[PDB]
Amino acid sequence: GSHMSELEKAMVALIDVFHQYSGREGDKHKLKKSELKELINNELSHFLEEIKEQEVVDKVMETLDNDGDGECDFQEFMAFVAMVTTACHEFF
Amino acid sequence: HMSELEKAMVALIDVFHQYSGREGDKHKLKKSELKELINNELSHFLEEIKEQEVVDKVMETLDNDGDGECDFQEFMAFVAMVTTACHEFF
């Protein structure tokens, strides 16, 4: 239809939450380990267990980071979202 | 008190379930379901699909396990692609 679909507004929300957190420290277009942690603990507090150990955020960043700059760009964050969403899906 | 990010993820699951459930395999998008999904729900991000050739090309790109349909994981890859391109105009 002509209204923004639920899908199209979901995509936008993904962009907004990324930019909401990537803009905090350093590079405004990437998530340092610092910003990723806050995102997870604050915005995924119903799907994922809170992170309070540094080893965890390091390992998550290690798995998310494919271009090897030690931070998560948007493309890499969409991959992360894909994984988590997939996990919630297998709840039938 | 669920977050916007979490609502967005859930809307992703919901729209897949809405369209995949219409025809055939209720857990997968066949070509016709995918086309309707794009035309009805992505009308502001993608140009409308009018040609079979176009449906064909899109599904082939998305179908990574070779069964001719788009399961959920293949749909998430699709949503990642689309969102990332849009991201460049934000």
Binding site: E49, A87 | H44, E47
Partner: peptide, 15 residues
């Protein structure tokens, strides 16, 4: 507006 065909753990006890 717009585009076209280009084409390039944990979890928890929840509802």
């Amino acid at each position: 507006a717009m585009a076209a065909t280009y084409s390039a753990r944990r979890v928890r006890k929840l509802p």
